[PDB]
Amino acid sequence: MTFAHEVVKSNVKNQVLFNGLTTSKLRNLMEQVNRLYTIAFNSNEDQLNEEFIDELEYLKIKFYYEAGREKSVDEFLKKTLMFPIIDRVIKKESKKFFLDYCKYFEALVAYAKYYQK
Amino acid sequence: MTFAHEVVKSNVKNQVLFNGLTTSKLRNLMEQVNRLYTIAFNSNEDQLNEEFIDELEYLKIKFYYEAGREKSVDEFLKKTLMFPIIDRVIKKESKKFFLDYCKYFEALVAYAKYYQK
Amino acid sequence: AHEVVKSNVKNQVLFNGLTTSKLRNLMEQVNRLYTIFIDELEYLKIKFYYEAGREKSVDEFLKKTLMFPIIDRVIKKESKKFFLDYCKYFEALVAYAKYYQK
Amino acid sequence: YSKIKISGTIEVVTGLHIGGGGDSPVVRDLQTKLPIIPGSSIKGKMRNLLAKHFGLKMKQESHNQDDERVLRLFGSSEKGNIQRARLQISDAFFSEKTKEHFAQNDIAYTETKFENTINRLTAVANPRQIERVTRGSEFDFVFIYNVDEESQVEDDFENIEKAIHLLENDYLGGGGTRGNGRIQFKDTNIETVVGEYDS
Amino acid sequence: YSKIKISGTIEVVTGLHIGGGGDSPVVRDLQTKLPIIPGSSIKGKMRNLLAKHFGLKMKQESHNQDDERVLRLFGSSEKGNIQRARLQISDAFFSEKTKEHFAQNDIAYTETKFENTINRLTAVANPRQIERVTRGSEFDFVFIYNVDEESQVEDDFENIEKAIHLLENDYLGGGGTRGNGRIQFKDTNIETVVGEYDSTNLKIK
Amino acid sequence: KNYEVVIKTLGPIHIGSGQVMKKQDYIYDFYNSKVYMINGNKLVKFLKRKNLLYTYQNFLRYPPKNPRENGLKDYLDAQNVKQSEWEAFVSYSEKLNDLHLMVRDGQNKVYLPGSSIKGAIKTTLVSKYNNEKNKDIYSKIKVSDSKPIDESNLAIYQKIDINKSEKSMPLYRECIDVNTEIKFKLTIEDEIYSINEIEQSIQDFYKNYYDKWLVGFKETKGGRRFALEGGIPDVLNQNILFLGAGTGFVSNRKQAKQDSFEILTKMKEALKGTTNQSRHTSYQQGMCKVSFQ
């Protein structure tokens, strides 16, 4: 799944990235993921609380909405397999996999910020 | 739950939406919802004041009038069990259920906006 | 509110085919007082009488709405809140009338 | 530094429909649930007409660079040259006397005007509806002029006065062509509020 | 080292549009999720106006070095000068009476007003929606004044008086030239929270 | 640019409004031919000052059926309300099962909507220029609504089907009375359609209408009477135009017949005018002389 993490360098075109994706339209996603990450940090056991799961549901809802609002972000989310990994995390209900996902998202975000107009 | 995604994907018919529903055709509805929502936020206790129950009936009145005015809104609300949900909300008078309602409806809007002309 | 209107659906003509076209002026009258003298409410009664003459369907409506007694008690109260609530009720009636339509 | 107040009152002469909120309603002031004239509308009718009375080149239209007097009078900074709006047009609201007269004479605040559609070769009657604000009503507005040069005030004020006449003759809001938008101005008052300027 | 507290009430004349958070929402708080006017806007607007009121050169317009009395009022401490601000502007909050009255009249705090940006040589009016706070609402504000030197409180208060009046016939917020942001000040009170300074002959109107 | 327009009501002009008042709140004179529009508020305030409101209501809900008993004037007579009082609660008067009202404003003042005037102007332009893209010029020529027209210039008239045998339509109309001088404003952004251009356009349209409809109803007494009144050739020179509703549906013969068949679709498989009792003079509704400044 790390090929989707170094694909960001594979998506450096001419001179726009991800068809003009900017961190100004992705800041909301970072804040929402970080908010749930702190809740997962407070959680001690592996088995996630149901309210936390619904939080994941709201997260994916936000993902879909953001993809709807902006096209470059939509390309990012689809081309990086965001929705399948989100559903998988929801399926696994494990904290540790969730932290793995957050790290993946962080790598995506940071690498994206490295390349910007 | 998130039965919303299923309803929207099933309504992707032939590229019409619920026979041509658009998000700008929902505006006041969401607006009204949002108003109640923030009021709902400011309250502390889960027991909803009689004035808020009257505002919930007012939201249902808005839904009924909008469904009567636009046939596509009527189909959306009919299939989405929106009126059942609202009636159940009125019966329940519990804040947490209301917040769940807010999330479900917002999801509906987001998914619909996800597939638009 | 809703109960009577959902119950007057004659299996599906509402009050034998009521149309909002007939309530327009009625609607207008309501809204005017809403912006805001008891004589104005009296004229409201009068206009109810006028439109109730205009069509039998509207008269059967207002009776099945118990409109006139409500208005009489409203004018009896003279309290602005009671009038506002009344207007809300009328709006609700109109709304459900609109929904259950051909 | 100095600020110039303008106090005045518009009277509506032909039926009026702005209809921002759009069976196609009109804008309303939510604390009063009453009509207003969103001063944005004033600004826009103003600038459009003024550009019309001055040079409006087709290339200048395409590039949205407006006449230098116009641009300086209302501030643009779209061509890269820093320009601060020299006049602000605020909103306006019903007058106390106007509302009092309406209540005393039982005058409705809004009119629904039917617009019948007739098609040639069929003459099929499909009415439409539209709302208009009661004609003859008056709103109180404010224009705030800012002084950025003690020598440009006279020229800028001259342009504003001629533009007020143009706004009176033309129609404001939508459906100007069908008879909606004729207003007059009355009771203009001029009084500088901040600074030591002679008016 | 005394501190003079100033309280007052912002009454919104026309629509108010901060728009900090953004389709583009205004700054709305988080604990009450009711909109507030972040002080940073207030202080910036008052500062820019008061700077304009005094002299301002193009070389002065270069890098935000401004007139010295204003500087003492707001602090720059930039050219190696020792200047900490003596007047701090806090945030504004949707005060309770407003929420109460609106609830008992069932009115929103925030409107969405739609604009039609017309394009020349195109004749297309594109709809853009702007969210702005409803009229007649109020916030409460607190300013803190510090007395770094005793015989300059009156002189600084004269500059404050001019800047406060400047805000009443100006717009605070976004895009006021389209007629949004007019505000007023009411119920001014002056107290010295900490110290032994008299603030009775002192007034702001 | 900008021009001031005067309108001379040659014949009755009426504008369809959509509010048809029936026998409710309607008082008429069978022996003076005058109908009195009645202030609802003042009338009911009198009704309460005599405590007969319940009586009036009970009459209102269920009409007595009998044609003579049916009527508000009869209700007032049953309550013996004095002719002095019966005059005291009259909003206004004009000279009848239903009545169609003209438009009124929030001040209940009758006016000629600029939309109707603009539509009639566009009709002459479309007929003369064969819609020379008249959809385009439609935006660049702006017409204001009319200034108020006081009541004394309002009248009730019976719709008359002028034909070989003059027929009478069942319903009546409020319409402006003769010769009324009515001013409004016009604004010009498309100078191609000059004022004189428009004037000649109107003239040509009327000339075409004359040889297509007016010359046909000859051998009718009332028909010929109107044509003689004033004189047709001099009227042809003037910018005459038919306004609002009630004008003939018309405003090659075989295509006209087919199209009229379609539009009326006996109708599935006729001139409008008004005939006066006062002077025994008929004027067709709609015609007005229009002049510029």
The DSSP line for E65-100 is: ---HHHHHHH----SS-----SEEE---EE-HHHHH
Contact E178 D48 (CB under 8 A): no
Can you tell me whether residue F29 is helix, strand or coil? coil
Residue from F2, F103, F115 whose CB has the most chain D CBs within 10 Å, to mutate: F115
F225, F215, F219: which is closest to F276 by C-alpha? F225
Distance in Å, alpha carbon of B8 to nearest chain A alpha carbon? 13
Q: Quote the tokens at residue F126.
A: 């479309």
Can you tell me whether residue A73 is helix, strand or coil? helix
Buried b (16+ CB within 10 A) or exposed e, F45-72: bbbeeeebbeebbebbeeeeeeeeeebb
What is the C-alpha to C-alpha distance for residues F125 and B116, in angstroms, rounded to an integer?
Answer: 42
User: What element of type H or E holds E50?
Assistant: helix E39-53
What approach was used to elucidate this structure? Answer: cryo-EM
For residue D190, say whether it is annotated as part of any ligand binding site. yes
- Distances, alpha carbon E200 to alpha carbons E191, E197, F2, in Å: 9, 10, 63
Contact C52 F45 (CB under 8 A): no
The alpha helices in D27-176, defined as continuous H runs, are: 39-53, 58-63, 68-74, 96-104, 153-169
Taking contacts as CB-CB distances below 8 angstroms, the residues of chain C near F98 are none
Buried b (16+ CB within 10 A) or exposed e, C5-27: beebeeeeebbeebbeeebeebe
- Distances, alpha carbon D107 to alpha carbons C35, D114, F108, in Å: 12, 19, 9
Taking contacts as CB-CB distances below 8 angstroms, the residues of chain C near D34 are 35
Q: Hunting for tokens 């009664």 — which residue is that? A: C45
The alpha helices in E113-176, defined as continuous H runs, are: 153-168
User: What element of type H or E holds E113?
Assistant: strand E110-119
Angle, CA D115 vertex, CA D112 and CA D119 arms, to 5°: 165
Contacts of A52 (CB under 8 A, 6+ apart): A36, A39, A40, A43
Taking contacts as CB-CB distances below 8 angstroms, the residues of chain E near D1 are 52-54
What is the C-alpha to C-alpha distance for residues F44 and D53, in angstroms, rounded to an integer?
Answer: 55
Can you tell me whether residue B81 is helix, strand or coil? coil
What is the C-alpha to C-alpha distance for residues F21 and C50, in angstroms, rounded to an integer?
Answer: 11
For D161, other C-beta atoms within 10 Å of its C-beta total 9
Taking contacts as CB-CB distances below 8 angstroms, the residues of chain D near E178 are 39-40, 43, 89
Can you tell me whether residue F93 is helix, strand or coil? strand
Q: Hunting for tokens 């001088």 — which residue is that? A: F181
Contact B106 A61 (CB under 8 A): yes
Contact F41 C39 (CB under 8 A): yes
What is the C-alpha to C-alpha distance for residues F22 and F19, in angstroms, rounded to an integer?
Answer: 10
DSSP state of F103: P
Q: In the complex, which subunits touch A with 3 or more CB pairs below 8 angstroms?
A: B
Four-CA torsion F69, F71, F73, F77, nearest 10 degrees: 20
Distance in Å, alpha carbon of E107 to nearest chain D alpha carbon? 7
Is residue F57 within 8 A of residue C49, CB to CB? The reply is yes
Residues in chain C: 102
Q: Quote the tokens at residue E98.
A: 């407003």
For residue E169, say whether it is annotated as part of any ligand binding site. yes
Question: Would the CA dihedral through F248, F254, F257, F259 be positive or negative?
Answer: negative
Taking contacts as CB-CB distances below 8 angstroms, the residues of chain C near D109 are 32, 35
| Biggest CA-to-CA distance, chain E | 67
Of D34, D108, D112, Cβ closest to residue C32: D108
B87, B117, B85, B90: which is closest to B101 by C-alpha? B85
Work out the end-to-end distance of chain F between its first and last CA atoms, rounded to an integer number of angstroms.
Answer: 12
Taking contacts as CB-CB distances below 8 angstroms, the residues of chain F near C62 are none
Q: Hunting for tokens 């959509």 — which residue is that? A: F18
Interface contact F51, partner C, CB < 8 A: no
Buried b (16+ CB within 10 A) or exposed e, B13-29: eeeebbeebbeebbeeb
**Domain encompassing residue D199:** 1-199
Distance in Å, alpha carbon of D194 to nearest chain E alpha carbon? 8
For A28, other C-beta atoms within 10 Å of its C-beta total 14
What is the C-alpha to C-alpha distance for residues E93 and E142, in angstroms, rounded to an integer?
Answer: 10
Nearest residue of E to residue B34, measured between CA atoms: E108
Q: Quote the tokens at residue B32.
A: 């009204």
Q: What is the 3-state secondary structure (H, E, C) of chain C?
A: CHHHHHHCEECCEECCCCCHHHHHHHHHHHHHHHHCCHHHHHHHHHHHHHHHHHCHHHHHHHHHCCHHHHHHHHHHHCCHHHHHHHHHHHHHHHHHHHHCCC
Q: Name the domain count of chain D.
A: 1
Burial class (CB in 10 A: 0-12, 13-18, 19+), E73: buried
Interface contact F113, partner D, CB < 8 A: yes
Query: Which amino acid belongs to residue F21?
Result: M
What is the C-alpha to C-alpha distance for residues E175 and F275, in angstroms, rounded to an integer?
Answer: 63
Distance in Å, alpha carbon of F41 to nearest chain C alpha carbon? 6
C69, C65, C51, C90: which is closest to C5 by C-alpha? C65
Can you tell me whether residue F133 is helix, strand or coil? coil
Is residue A86 within 8 A of residue A60, CB to CB? The reply is yes
Is residue F148 within 8 A of residue F109, CB to CB? The reply is yes
Burial class (CB in 10 A: 0-12, 13-18, 19+), D74: buried
F231, F181, F179: which is closest to F210 by C-alpha? F231
- Distances, alpha carbon A6 to alpha carbons A11, A87, A89, A98, A109, in Å: 9, 22, 21, 20, 11
Contact E176 D88 (CB under 8 A): yes
Q: Hunting for tokens 């509906």 — which residue is that? A: B108
What is the C-alpha to C-alpha distance for residues B47 and D199, in angstroms, rounded to an integer?
Answer: 62
Q: Are strands B12-13 and B16-17 parallel, antiparallel or unpaired?
A: antiparallel
Buried b (16+ CB within 10 A) or exposed e, F98-137: ebbbbbebbeebbbbbbbbbbbbbbbbbbbbeeeeebeeb
What is the C-alpha to C-alpha distance for residues A103 and A81, in angstroms, rounded to an integer?
Answer: 15
F138, F184, F7: which is closest to D15 by C-alpha? F184
Interface contact F23, partner C, CB < 8 A: no
Contacts of F167 (CB under 8 A, 6+ apart): F160, F161
Q: In the complex, which subunits touch C with 3 or more CB pairs below 8 angstroms?
A: B, D, F
Q: Are strands D126-133 and E93-94 parallel, antiparallel or unpaired?
A: unpaired
What is the C-alpha to C-alpha distance for residues F61 and C55, in angstroms, rounded to an integer?
Answer: 10
What is the C-alpha to C-alpha distance for residues B27 and F154, in angstroms, rounded to an integer?
Answer: 46
DSSP state of E173: S
Contact A/B (≥3 CB pairs under 8 Å): yes
Q: Hunting for tokens 């995604």 — which residue is that? A: B5
Q: Quote the tokens at residue D8.
A: 């005045």
Is residue F159 within 8 A of residue F149, CB to CB? The reply is no
DSSP state of F158: E
Of D31, D38, D64, Cβ closest to residue E120: D64
E91, E93, E83: which is closest to E156 by C-alpha? E83
